[PDB]
Structure formats: C-alpha cells, structure tokens
Design a protein around this ligand. Structure first.
Ligand SMILES: Cc1cc2nc3c(=O)[nH]c(=O)nc-3n(C[C@H](O)[C@H](O)[C@H](O)COP(=O)(O)O)c2cc1C
Length: 337
C-alpha cells in the first residue's frame, strides 16, 4: 500500500483544540515534514487549499498558505517523493493550472500531480465575489468535466480548441508539456464525484471512518470500484486517517482524550467510541505503534484501497515514530529497503 502525508498548509493541522500543538503553517515547517517523510519512503505529499478559516480561540485555518506555490517550493528541496497541489477550480483558469503543473514538473523532474476540487464551501468563494450561485451544487461536476478536458488537451498536445458551457478555447497554447504523464487525483465522495474520478483521475481520495475501525470506509471504496467498472479504468481509493500513536494503547488514548478535552467550541460552531469534531470527525487510528501498524495492514486488505493519506497530532514526531516504529511492522510496507 502507498503512504502519503497531508502537509499542514493551515495552522494547527487537523486538530481544533487548545490542548493540541499550536503552530503556524510555514514553508520551513512543511519543508522539515516533507524531507522527513521522503527519508522514511513516504510515496507522496499532498496539500489542500483552504481559502477561509473557522476562527475561535485557535483561529483554526484562519492562516493558510497557497497550495501550488507551497508545493513548487517543496519540489525544489526534495528528489523522490511525489508532490501534489490542490486546484480550487473556481479560482484559477485551466490554462494557468496547466502551465503551473508543467512548471512544477520541471522543478521536480516529473514528480508532480494535481488534486482537482470543485469547492463546496460557499463562503470561501462568496467572500471574493466568485461564487457562481446555488446551481453550482448540482452542476459543479459538469464544470469540472469541462475544466479537465481543457487540461488534458493542453498537457497531451500543447493546445486546446475546447468550447463548452463554461470555457471557450481559441487555439489556447501551453508548452512545455509535462515530461511524464500528468497525474490527476480527485476527492469525490458523491456519485457524480466518483463518476468524474472514474473517467479522469488516477486515484480517488476518500475519508477514513470511525475511531479504530480501519475497515469502516469499505462501502465507500466499493462504490468507487463500481464507478471505475463503468469506465474500465483502474482508479483506486486513497483513504485519509489521523494517526495518534504512542508506546502503549493507553498512552495514545490519553493523548486523544486530552485533545478532545481542549476542543475549541467556538471554531467547531462555525464548522457545523465515537469520532470527534476535534479533528472534523476524521477517521482516527489511536494506539500503540504495533496496534496502528495492525490497523493500517487491515486498511490495506479493503477491496479498492491502494493507499492512505496520513495526518498526525504532531507531524515532526509522528512521521519519525511512523518511520521508526510503525512502518517496520506493516506487512503492506515489506517491499521497502
Ligand atoms: C483528502 C481530501 C482532500 C480534500 N481537499 C479539498 C481541498 O483542498 N479543497 C476543497 O475545496 N475540497 C477538498 N476536499 C473535498 C472534496 O473535493 C469533495 O468536495 C468532498 O470529498 C465531497 O464529495 P463530493 O464533491 O463528490 O460531494 C477534499 C476531500 C478529501 C477526501
């Protein structure tokens, strides 16, 4: 199974708690994280794009870097890990994304790909006057289909004459073309989103589910395999989890409970053994290094699951303990050096 790191482009990562680590997203922090992930043979690093935060005591996601420029900088200081940026497709013309992708292909020597998102949180767009209206909720994958057609023309041939409802290309040109086939990834959970992914993506990201129920996402990965059957394309599932690991199950549980006890309720308001809002009800693996290794090996056995995208409570120590204590016990990582 492949392992990626979801890099903290927003302050405080994925914990909405006064008891969680408090930190700003800097370049040098994301550089340290990605160089340590690459050292431990992580396969990829992805950044999201988040254009508005949730406030509260922790100013949660009020502070966020931009994904293409962050990943261009990270590409320059790495050599092997795959680098993915997220395009909020309402915010960038497709010929600009095409050229940014060819640029980071150049920086990285062919390690770059794009996560294409529709956007769904109206305020991120309404705040800058570019929300297309509430018809977007139902038509957004029609928009994304035209967007990706323009991208595939430009990457594949260097030109597009595409004409649709949303885009008009009149001999649009982007060269250079990427040195390797450009990877497109999607994070579609809906039927329309999975249908898009099945037609155009290399793989689809989905949410891990529950606390210490690693296989609870299986129905989502089954729906995505069904969507991929309809195109005949091999489009696997990469599943998002948070890992809270320690020397013992009891020690990891104590950390998780300490984070939940600090929940930043004002920030959680704006956003509105169970999952907790403290990490946006993310799929969570809480245990000893050995327990987390066993639970990740169970993820690897789910039909359609090809990888995991990981967040941690503390990225610098969480990547280190992952590489030193968890990954060496994982049957699904026995292929590493
Ligand atoms: C790993 C992951 C990363 C995501 N990143 C973003 C992002 O950066 N920006 C964004 O607007 N939406 C993001 N999303 C939301 C998805 O693109 C998508 O809208 C959501 O999964 C709901 O599916 P649907 O679009 O098919 O309803 C992400 C989802 C997942 C699972």
């Amino acid at each position: 199974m492949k392992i990626g790191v979801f890099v903290p482009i927003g302050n405080n990562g994925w914990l909405i708690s006064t008891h969680a680590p408090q930190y700003m997203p800097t370049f040098e922090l994301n550089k340290a994280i990605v160089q340590k992930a690459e050292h431990y043979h992580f396969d990829f690093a992805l950044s999201m794009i988040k254009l508005r935060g949730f406030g509260g005591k922790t100013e949660f996601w009020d502070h966020n870097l931009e994904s293409f420029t962050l990943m261009a900088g990270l590409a320059a200081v790495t050599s092997r890990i795959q680098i993915y940026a997220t395009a909020a497709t309402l915010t960038l013309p497709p010929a600009i994304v095409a050229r940014m992708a060819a640029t980071i292909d150049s920086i990285s020597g062919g390690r770059f790909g794009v996560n294409l998102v529709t956007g769904w949180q109206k305020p991120e767009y309404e705040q800058m006057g570019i929300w297309p209206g509430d018809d977007y909720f139902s038509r957004r994958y029609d928009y994304l289909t035209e967007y990706v057609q323009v991208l595939r023309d430009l990457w594949g041939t260097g030109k597009s004459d595409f004409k649709g409802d949303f885009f008009t290309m009149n001999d649009c040109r982007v060269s250079p073309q990427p040195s390797v086939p450009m990877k497109v990834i999607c994070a579609g959970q809906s039927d329309a989103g999975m249908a898009f992914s099945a037609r155009y993506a290399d793989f689809n990201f989905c949410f891990g589910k529950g606390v210490n129920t690693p296989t609870a996402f299986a129905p989502t990965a089954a729906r995505m395999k069904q969507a991929a059957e309809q195109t005949g394309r091999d489009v696997g599932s990469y599943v998002l989890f948070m890992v809270i690991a320690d020397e013992t199950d009891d020690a990891a549980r104590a950390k998780w409970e300490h984070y939940k006890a600090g929940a930043d309720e004002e920030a959680l308001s704006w956003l509105t053994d169970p999952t907790s809002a403290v990490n946006i009800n993310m799929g969570t693996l809480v245990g000893s290094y050995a327990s987390v290794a066993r639970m990740l090996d169970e993820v690897a056995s789910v039909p359609g699951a090809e990888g995991v995208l990981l967040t941690f409570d503390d990225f610098l120590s969480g990547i280190e303990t992952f590489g030193e204590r968890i990954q060496p016990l994982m049957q699904c990582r026995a292929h590493l050096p």
